[PDB]
Amino acid sequence: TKAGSLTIVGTGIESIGQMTLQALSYIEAAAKVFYCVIDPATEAFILTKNKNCVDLYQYYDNGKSRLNTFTQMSELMVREVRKGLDVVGVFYGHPGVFVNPSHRALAIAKSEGYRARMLPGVSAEDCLFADLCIDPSNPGCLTYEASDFLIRDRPVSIHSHLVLFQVGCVGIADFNFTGFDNNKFGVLVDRLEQEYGAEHPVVHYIAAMMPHQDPVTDKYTVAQLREPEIAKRVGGVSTFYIPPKARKASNLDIIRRLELLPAGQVPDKKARIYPANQWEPDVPEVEPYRPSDQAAIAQLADHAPPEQYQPLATSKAMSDVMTKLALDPKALADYKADHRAFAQSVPDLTPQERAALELGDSWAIRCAMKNMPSSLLDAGFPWVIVVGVIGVIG
Amino acid sequence: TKAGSLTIVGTGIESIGQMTLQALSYIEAAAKVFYCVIDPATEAFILTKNKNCVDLYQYYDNGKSRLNTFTQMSELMVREVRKGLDVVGVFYGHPGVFVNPSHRALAIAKSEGYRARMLPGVSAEDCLFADLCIDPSNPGCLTYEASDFLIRDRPVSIHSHLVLFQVGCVGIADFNFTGFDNNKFGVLVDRLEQEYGAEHPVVHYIAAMMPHQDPVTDKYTVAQLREPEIAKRVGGVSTFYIPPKARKASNLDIIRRLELLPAGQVPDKKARIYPANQWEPDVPEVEPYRPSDQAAIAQLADHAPPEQYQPLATSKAMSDVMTKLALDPKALADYKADHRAFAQSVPDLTPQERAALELGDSWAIRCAMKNMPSSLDAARGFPWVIVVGVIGVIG
Numbered sequence: 001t002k003a004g005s006l007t008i009v010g011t012g013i014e015s016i017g018q019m020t021l022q023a024l025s026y027i028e029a030a031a032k033v034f035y036c037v038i039d040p041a042t043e044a045f046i047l048t049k050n051k052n053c054v055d056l057y058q059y060y061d062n063g064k065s066r067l068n069t070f071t072q073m074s075e076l077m078v079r080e081v082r083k084g085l086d087v088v089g090v091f092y093g094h095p096g097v098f099v100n101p102s103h104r105a106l107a108i109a110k111s112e113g114y115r116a117r118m119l120p121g122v123s124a125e126d127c128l129f130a131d132l133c134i135d136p137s138n139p140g141c142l143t144y145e146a147s148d149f150l151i152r153d154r155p156v157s158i159h160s161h162l163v164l165f166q167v168g169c170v171g172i173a174d175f176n177f178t179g180f181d182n183n184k185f186g187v188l189v190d191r192l193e194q195e196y197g198a199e200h201p202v203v204h205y206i207a208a209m210m211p212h213q214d215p216v217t218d219k220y221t222v223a224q225l226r227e228p229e230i231a232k233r234v235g236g237v238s239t240f241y242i243p244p245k246a247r248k249a250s251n252l253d254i255i256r257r258l259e260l261l262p263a264g265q266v267p268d269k270k271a272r273i274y275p276a277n278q279w280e281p282d283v284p285e286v287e288p289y290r291p292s293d294q295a296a297i298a299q300l301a302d303h304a305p306p307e308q309y310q311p312l313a314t315s316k317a318m319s320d321v322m323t324k325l326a327l328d329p330k331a332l333a334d335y336k337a338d339h340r341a342f343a344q345s346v347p348d349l350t351p352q353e354r355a356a357l358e359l360g361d362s363w364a365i366r367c368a369m370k371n372m373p374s375s376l377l378d379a380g381f382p383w384v385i386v387v388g389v390i391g392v393i394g
Numbered sequence: 395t396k397a398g399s400l401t402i403v404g405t406g407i408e409s410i411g412q413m414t415l416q417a418l419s420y421i422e423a424a425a426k427v428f429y430c431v432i433d434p435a436t437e438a439f440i441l442t443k444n445k446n447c448v449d450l451y452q453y454y455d456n457g458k459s460r461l462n463t464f465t466q467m468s469e470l471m472v473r474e475v476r477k478g479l480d481v482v483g484v485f486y487g488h489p490g491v492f493v494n495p496s497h498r499a500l501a502i503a504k505s506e507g508y509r510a511r512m513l514p515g516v517s518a519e520d521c522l523f524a525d526l527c528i529d530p531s532n533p534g535c536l537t538y539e540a541s542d543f544l545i546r547d548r549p550v551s552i553h554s555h556l557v558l559f560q561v562g563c564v565g566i567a568d569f570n571f572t573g574f575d576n577n578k579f580g581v582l583v584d585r586l587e588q589e590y591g592a593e594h595p596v597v598h599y600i601a602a603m604m605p606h607q608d609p610v611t612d613k614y615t616v617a618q619l620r621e622p623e624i625a626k627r628v629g630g631v632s633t634f635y636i637p638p639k640a641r642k643a644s645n646l647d648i649i650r651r652l653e654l655l656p657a658g659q660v661p662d663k664k665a666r667i668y669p670a671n672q673w674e675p676d677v678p679e680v681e682p683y684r685p686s687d688q689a690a691i692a693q694l695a696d697h698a699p700p701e702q703y704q705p706l707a708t709s710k711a712m713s714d715v716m717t718k719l720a721l722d723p724k725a726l727a728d729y730k731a732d733h734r735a736f737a738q739s740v741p742d743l744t745p746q747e748r749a750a751l752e753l754g755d756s757w758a759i760r761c762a763m764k765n766m767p768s769s770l771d772a773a774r775g776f777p778w779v780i781v782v783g784v785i786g787v788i789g
């Protein structure tokens with residue numbers, strides 16, 4: 001294996017606090033850091049954690065093609081990889097979600113035979129779900145770039161969530177330091193009118209970028225987006241959320257094949273699990289405390305853990321080593337090079353803890369860290385799921 | 395305002411490392427922590443950070459309805475909020491992505507007048523994009539729960555990415571500790587055959603849950619999913635990625651209205667920005683170093699920052715306060731209660747720094763931490779970074 005590595009990481013959206021613990025650890029360990037971030041508090045923070053940082057934003061310029069900038073950013077990173085160094089690239093949000101140069105740099109590095117990896121981060125869509133109080137699972141989610149959405153005539157589903165990025169620069173790919181003049185916005189509004197109608201809601205969303213700010217969560221009708229003083233509020237960090245227009249019915253063949261009925265139970269398509277989506281037009285009130293909810297809450301007084309439940313039963317030495325593997329990239333690289341040698345040098349481990357670390361298998365680690373009861377084995381991964389349509393049928 | 399708050403946070407997918415700095419700080423600051431996580435190293439880590447934690451997973455049981463469990467989890471959290479405490483709920487991944495009880499608890503607390511907020515985290519879909527080397531923007535992304543996909547007959551787009559969660563428990567909502575018997579998996583395989591054809595690829599994806607493990611990124615044809623040896627590999631943490639079957643063409647009217655028009659250039663739908671999606675069937679090789687790429691690289695030697703570029707120009711004292719507001723929830727609460735009193739007790743700030751913090755305005759803070767040059771008063775101002783696809787392969 002060749003000297004040199006490229007790891008691309010994210011900052012998240014909200015300054016400093018939305019960075020992951022592993023993103024931070026890689027930035028600290030790197031020989032060289034290259035970054036493109038949105039706010040100066042995040043920039044200042046990065047520079048305190050590594051002595052050899054370069055700002056990629058300086059490679060944009062007025063009238064200079066963005067694709068030429070991306071080629072330059074990628075080549076700067078890959079040049080240091082070719083010299084045998086551990087390089088880290090840092091981008092705003094999740095570094096592979098609506099970003100060009102990260103994918104280019106990683107693919108070049110990988111094809112020339114160097115180690116290459118992207119670490120995930122928190123994206124603007126992750127913030128959207130949290131701030132607007134929606135779940136992509138209910139009733140499904142479509143995500144597009146706004147100019148692509150129009151140019152390639154991408155389909156909408158009126159029964160699912162729709163999220164549109166880059167609504168502030170329709171049809172514009174030029175760079176200018178004073179930013180976008182969005183004079184083809186009306187082409188997007190026309191499309192939304194044809195798909196949803198003039199009175200359907202559109203939510204203007206801007207996630208807070210500093211820890212003290214509130215998010216923008218402003219509902220307008222499609223028609224109001226034609227008003228000049230509303231249209232001008234949409235800029236370079238604006239995203240649209242468009243809620244469903246209707247509820248989709250269930251397919252009788254699938255109901256049969258999945259054996260979800262004894263008779264026609266009357267699970268109406270409009271019947272919902274609390275809470276309902278508050279942006280959806282003409283959505284009725286859902287009762288949070290039904291008779292079945294009240295009865296479930298009554299059982300809490302008598303509750304004990306079930307006999308099959310596995311309590312945590314670990315040690316300081318074992319918790320410390322699992323933490324070190326997640327937060328120290330050098331410790332992890334040593335462990336992966338030689339499981340046994342590494343396991344032997346960790347002090348205070350019991351024989352089981354040492355044996356599980358030597359093997360590295362998930363089940364071995366679970367047994368060393370959790371007490372497994374007789375009743376469970378006689379018949380042990382969690383099995384947590386989201387419930388929607390099935391829980392409201394039978 | 396009523397005493398008490400609820401903050402729901404995530405742990406991410408890979409044990410410990412994928413937790414956010416703010417998730418950790420809220421767990422440390424809470425009066426009571428309630429958690430549901432699926433690996434013991436993450437559980438042990440949480441327990442080292444707060445002395446009053448309760449595992450919510452103990453409220454599942456064999457034959458007991460998952461909805462009744464959800465009602466119970468929600469009520470344990472909100473009972474403590476109603477006592478005036480700062481409560482933190484912790485869920486695997488992103489706490490609002492394919493999760494029931496988080497939304498219920500937050501909605502109840504909000505309607506009754508308490509402070510309520512969800513902090514985003516890293517989901518399994520975030521992991522998927524990073525490990526499979528795809529971008530949702532190119533060529534768009536549809537995400538569904540697998541049983542909902544079948545029952546409500548949700549539409550596919552053959553020209554965009556498709557992501558399906560919960561493919562290991564098609565049609566089944568019961569709880570059992572010994573787990574899912576995935577007997578209706580064939581119903582999903584039939585639908586994928588109808589929509590994509592028997593020889594189209596499906597990627598079986600499992601993100602690494604421990605730091606030393608590799609992800610599962612195994613490509614199969616739809617037809618191969620009918621083989622029992624392959625179907626048995628699909629479990630409770632399995633997600634499917636199905637890549638596009640074809641490239642979608644551009645609309646002439648939109649090209650004309652957006653003025654990307656001059657002469658009719660012949661930018662083909664199959665032509666792509668490097669790199670191409672490696673999972674897509676019959677994807678052509680794309681050249682990383684075209685003549686224009688080489689010309690751009692040659693300009694690197696003569697490069698200087700543009701006149702309008704804004705270098706960072708801040709202080710240790712200002713950087714420390716902005717870091718503290720992000721990592722210390724009590725300091726943030728104090729700052730929000732009264733900007734001016736907080737700003738006046740921070741030592742070593744310059745007059746401009748102190749004034750910007752008194753205002754709280756993002757432009758004022760930016761101007762205090764960056765050298766904004768005279769070539770740049772257009773405001774009466776973020777980076778202006780975008781993704782480029784179709785437009786960059788036209789004009």
Ligand SMILES: C[S@@+](CC[C@H](N)C(=O)[O-])C[C@H]1O[C@@H](n2cnc3c(N)ncnc32)[C@H](O)[C@@H]1O
Pocket residue numbers: 013092093094095096097098099122123124125164165166167168205206207208209236237238239779780781
């Ligand atoms: C080039 S993309 C960068 C996306 C980033 N990598 C991420 O993880 O979200 C630019 C677009 O992201 C979205 N975006 C960026 N910041 C945002 C914010 N604070 N709130 C809402 N959307 C935002 C907007 O649609 C913007 O046009």
Ligand SMILES: C[S@@+](CC[C@H](N)C(=O)[O-])C[C@H]1O[C@@H](n2cnc3c(N)ncnc32)[C@H](O)[C@@H]1O
Pocket residue numbers: 384385386407486487488489490491492493516517518519558559560561562599600601602603630631632633
């Ligand atoms: C109830 S959901 C929870 C999702 C979680 N909140 C998140 O942010 O991704 C369970 C489903 O998430 C997906 N999932 C969970 N862990 C995963 C992993 N390690 N790799 C791939 N998919 C996973 C699977 O589709 C699984 O059936």
